[PDB]
Design a protein around this ligand. Sequence first.
Ligand SMILES: CC(C)n1nc(-c2ccc3oc(N)nc3c2)c2c(N)ncnc21
Length: 910
Amino acid sequence: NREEKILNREIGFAIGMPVCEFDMVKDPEVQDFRRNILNVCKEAVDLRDLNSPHSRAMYVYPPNVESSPELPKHIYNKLDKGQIIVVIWVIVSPNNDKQKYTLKINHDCVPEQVIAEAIRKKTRSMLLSSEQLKLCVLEYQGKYILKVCGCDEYFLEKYPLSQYKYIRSCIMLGRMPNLMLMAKESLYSQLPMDCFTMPSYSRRTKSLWVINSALRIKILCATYVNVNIRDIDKIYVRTGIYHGGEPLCDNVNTQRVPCSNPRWNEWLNYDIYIPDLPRAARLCLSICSVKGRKGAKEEHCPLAWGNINLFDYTDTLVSGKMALNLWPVPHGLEDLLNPIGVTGSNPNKETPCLELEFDWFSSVVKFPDMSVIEEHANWSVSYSHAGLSNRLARDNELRENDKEQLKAISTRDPLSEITEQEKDFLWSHRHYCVTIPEILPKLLLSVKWNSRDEVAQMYCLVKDWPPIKPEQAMELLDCNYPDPMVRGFAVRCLEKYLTDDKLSQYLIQLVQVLKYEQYLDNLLVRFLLKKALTNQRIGHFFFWHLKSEMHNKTVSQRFGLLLESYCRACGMYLKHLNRQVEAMEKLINLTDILKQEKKDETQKVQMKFLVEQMRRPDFMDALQGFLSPLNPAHQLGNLRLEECRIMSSAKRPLWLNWENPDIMSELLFQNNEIIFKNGDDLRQDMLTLQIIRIMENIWQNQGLDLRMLPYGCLSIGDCVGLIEVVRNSHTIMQIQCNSHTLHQWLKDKNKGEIYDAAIDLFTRSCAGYCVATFILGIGDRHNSNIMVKDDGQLFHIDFGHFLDHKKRERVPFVLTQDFLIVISKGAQECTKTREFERFQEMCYKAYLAIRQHANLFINLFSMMLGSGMPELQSFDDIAYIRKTLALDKTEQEALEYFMKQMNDAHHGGW
Ligand SMILES: CC(C)n1nc(-c2ccc3oc(N)nc3c2)c2c(N)ncnc21
């Protein structure tokens, strides 16, 4: 009633469009999705109310843990005899006195064991309780919970203390962990119980295989096809039947008609049997122009494109009259068709519009049930009769060379081209493939999707297919794998083997591949929403990754509806997301005014305006007392306007400073510094920074302490976003204030016995960033986009473009004598040193480690193909890292290559 209205108003502000606009959408798929997705909402809420309050605190404050408890060789070695020193703080009776208790405990100690040990140290003063009954009422560890001093991170689950990301970091960085003992009932009360309500909208035949006919589609007429008559001669419609990025038959064009009258009334006949149409078959079309000639070949140009699914969300083969509002052709489209393009009708109806008719076979035609599929697969299942086609291998036919040949095929990278000889081979030996389940993505590409008999066989193999690694399953979710039985299996592996640490790690890819789903209601959307609604850390980024694309009409309906369902069931977080949403709004409206009206003024004038505009009551209210969209465990107190400045950088970003309202702010950072950028697409920087974190985690799990700085970066909208500020760090140029200038500065900041640890950090971070940038083909490095910390850690900022920004593999990070003098610790011939010898083997061991995990990076890039990212628009883009990692070459041939690239850029040494 009145409360539904408030909520409707609250969701409307969060997603950026009124809920009422979803109610007017006549599409049954839309209204069904809104109503039918509500069971995920119910289930998620029920799980939160299972063991209240704890159950609800786990949702709000989930454990920030690593996937594996096992501490690597070098990490366990930082512990003194396998024991970690921790500092526990108690806020005692006001004037809120902070009292510390320093403890030495095993790294595998559970938080409850730590609370007891802290109470044991605290009570030690009263020696009466020390000897007699050391217990102290079971040391009431159920009356207290651990919190991270300085931020809203809690230790609520029975995990070894070292498995917690904060504690593992503290071990690696040589920092003492400061924890705060906070009474259980004080957190539990701060949590308002959820009152999830069901919305008002929540109330409201023949089989395909019996149609012994060829497919046909009628192409009627086109409107809103406004064309300069003087240029174009004729216009025709190019059409094709696809399954993902692969055609099921040959592409059929209509007759050419004068552009003044786009009227065809033609029935287009295709090279495909109707029972032979796979589930994910789609019609792909475009309106093309043709003018010439100069006595040469005809100048074909695609005007606008569109794709329709041959079957609707209810498995119904689309029948009857239709209208498709076409889409503009994106720059550099090498084809007349756009199969990898978004499927569906353009929301703007003032765009070219193709009117079609599909066949009507006297009744509602539907895709057969699995019972009919299995009964046509068991129905599918001599010496010279099993050998009349290279797609059948009988019993007593499996060779030991074949077993190793299939094994060799499985090793090959995702972009490694399977030959047609190799496809017939994988298909004939499909039943052995179950022994090495990792072969599935290659085997699935060996299927002739245009054959019902072949596809039905594949469907049965997928049914009883051994689950694969979560990282391995993610490929089966890219554009290449449209089939629901395939994608459903991939979701099933993630549903089972994917940790919440890894879901947070790969969330952007998982949000992206959603655009490759045929329907609004699928197993991926349900998987992701459930995780978003049972973990508020995942939930936060699901919301922001989806909100940041609401300006993109290609996805705004899917995403809008997904955000509607999310906002109804997230609970209290909605009020906090709304605060962030309003904060970001005010920074966009303000940075817009500066860019449009005041760009041509002095820093002094611009700052005067900034300060005046920020001091306004409506502004001050919105921009203080909210959670950092970058890390929502960060409270952003009051603005420190005296520390807020417009940066001299390009797009003139705002450096913003907030107080940290935590009582233990001083034990983390007393002030939160975020950079607000308006003007650049922050999406490439999110992907690079994600890849850097992954490369770093790989090296750290092999015994390579090559420290990276994957700083926070979050795209919050259309070329607007947030950048984390790396505290106490300076660019190479702001160190030059000769050749020893850098080494001089580092040696100065790190004087004494702290010098030998600061040198190692430079050389190790340098080796990591040197290997990372080469492989990735990041934008060329200079004195301004290389930064150094007052401890020794080197890192890069502003990545620009990845892969081939040129359009024949570069070394973007070339080492100046400065960096090499720090490595060789002042040495004259920095080439022939014992220090550079230890640095060479760092770069070599780093490069080979990434080579081993090539298939993950290739996959993480392919999932991101859906994104409008100009440097990631084709599989020919991702192809770059297949060159840098020398995947065709051997492990020794690849090492020689890396040395040659470094040598032909640094002019020797290696
Ligand atoms: C040069 C100096 C002021 N500085 N600049 C940045 C910075 C600014 C914008 C960016 O856009 C992207 N993509 N990466 C960026 C990095 C920065 C930081 N993140 N931490 C510390 N100092 C920093």
